[PDB]
């Protein structure tokens, strides 16, 4: 109805404001319709997935050049690598999102995937490029909502 249009405006305004506050505080990064955020912790892959899901989100994963630079900037800011939301399929060499879908956008550091042993997980360098690796290292936890 009439009052309906009104209320919707106020709500939109408020959400924008709170999103502005968290942005200014640097506690979140908005890219398109994805929101990236970190609590500053550096734990292993399994642990990170828990944190994100516990918070209502998911371990972060870039699907576009812009989302990738957004996550890299957080990594750069904390001077630590980031574990991305993806693991290697059954047939080595290929990676898939946790939902099971196979990865589309990639940004491997020249030569990767390449490595010592299994290397089923993916870490992001502070420059944004990816490197496959083990899942037991301590990496900055970054989630997407």
Among 26, 32, 65, 115, binds a second copy (CB under 8 A): 26
- The 72-111 site mask, x for binding Sm ion (CB under 5 A), equals --------------------x-------------------
What is the Rg, in whole angstroms, of the alpha carbon atoms belonging to the chain?
A: 17
Q: Which residues are annotated as a binding site for Ca(2+)?
A: 112, 114, 131-132
Stretch in the footprint of a second copy (CB under 8 A) among 55-63, 100-108, 110-118, 132-140: 55-63
Q: Is 73 exposed, middle or buried (0-12, 13-18, 19+ CB in 10 A)?
A: middle
For the chain, give the secondary structure using H, E and C. CHHHHHHHHHHHHHHHHHHHHHHHCCCCEEECCEEEEEEEEEECHHHHHHHHHHCCCEECCCCCHHHHHHHHHHHHHHCCCEEEEEEECCCCCCEEECCCCECCCCCECCCCCCCCCCCCEEEECCCCCEEEECCCCCEEEEEEC
- Residue 56 within binding range of a second copy, rule CB under 8 A: yes
Q: Which of a second copy, Sm ion, none is residue 123 near (CB under 5 to 8 Å by kind)?
A: none
State in angstroms the smallest separation of the CB of 83 from Sm ion: 13
Count, residues near Sm ion per rule CB under 5 A:
5
Q: Which of Sm ion, a second copy, none is residue 15 near (CB under 5 to 8 Å by kind)?
A: a second copy
Binding site for Sm ion (CB under 5 A): 92, 115, 119, 131-132
Residue numbers at the binding site for a second copy (CB under 8 A): 7-8, 10-28, 33, 35, 37-39, 51-52, 54-57, 143, 145
């Amino acid at each position: 109805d009439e009052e309906l249009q009104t209320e919707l405006y106020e709500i939109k305004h408020q959400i924008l404001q709170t999103m502005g506050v968290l942005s200014l505080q640097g506690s979140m990064l908005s890219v398109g319709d994805k929101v990236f955020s970190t609590n500053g912790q550096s734990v292993n892959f399994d642990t990170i997935k828990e944190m994100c899901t516990r918070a209502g989100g998911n371990i972060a994963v870039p699907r576009t050049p812009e989302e990738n630079e957004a996550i890299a900037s957080i990594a750069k800011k904390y001077n630590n690598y980031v574990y991305l939301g993806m693991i290697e399929d059954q047939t080595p060499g290929d990676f898939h999102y946790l939902d099971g879908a196979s990865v589309s956008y990639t940004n491997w550091y020249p030569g990767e995937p390449r490595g010592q042993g299994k290397e089923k997980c993916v870490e992001m360098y502070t420059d944004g490029t990816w490197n496959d690796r083990g899942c037991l290292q301590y990496r900055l936890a970054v989630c997407e909502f």
